[model samples]
Target: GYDNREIVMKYIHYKLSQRGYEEVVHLTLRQAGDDFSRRYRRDFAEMSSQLHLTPFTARGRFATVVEELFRDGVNWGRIVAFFEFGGVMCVESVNREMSPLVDNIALWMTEYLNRHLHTWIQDNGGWDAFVELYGP
Candidate 1:
């Protein structure tokens, strides 16, 4: 089977590389993250600390923490928020040099996507559809 998660991660990084070094942010991912952050600012503030995370992935059961973030199940909003959460992680990576470093967000995100979100995204028209729904 294809590593769609890794492919998506690589694609996003490739897109990220298109930007200036001083402003290495992806428009759609950051937008998704911002929407999630704004909508759940309070919750994210709490989660930012409570998860004991670097955005989402950690070697220490971080994937488990991410699992529950969608306890209500997958949907457009939640998936967007997940990307949002991931965006913040990238910020953290750029800021503090975290474990799931900027280069590794791909692996971290890919693992989780392949493990958890792959099926849902596949059923829901894939990542291109995801871009359309969330992009401007």
Candidate 2:
């Protein structure tokens, strides 16, 4: 399980490097520590209240968070920070049903990052070239 987690994180960091986002990952990761976690929970709670969210449902809240991320600028750093945040939430999710919501948020984050990576690969010279540059 830790290996799986390590692979996931390394792939994210690798992709960030490939896409020239090397500078910010460390900064973002450092920021993703306790302080960010605290603010994340607080902000998410506030947003839920303001949006009239149904209690504990996680309903439509992912969209709100995604929008906030984009509004803040969809940089690799910010995306990765959000990914880390979601991973923690997934682990701490209250029950089975909520687990999937947390999981999907993490999935959405990777899908978003992968979409950017895919475009970069395609635009730079397609899959073969990407493999040549980054490996099999």
Q: Quick one: best lDDT, which candidate?
A: 1
State the displacement of the C-alpha of residue 27, model 2, in Å, after optimal TM-score superposition.
Answer: 12
Error of 1 at 35 (Å): 1.8
Residue lDDT tens for model 2, 20-98: 4432323334344334446677764554245332335444655566566667444434544455544444433423334
lDDT of 1: 0.60
- Per-candidate Cα lDDT values, in order, are 0.60, 0.45
For residues 20-117, write the lDDT of model 1, one tens digit per residue: 32311245655665567778889778665554445444544345656777887888677666665565555545555563465566666677777778
Model 2, runs deviating above 4 Å: 1-31, 38-59, 88-92, 95-97, 116-136
Q: Pick the candidate with the highest TM-score.
A: 1
Displacement of the residue 36 alpha carbon in candidate 2, Å: 2.9
At residue 44, candidate 1 shows an lDDT of 76
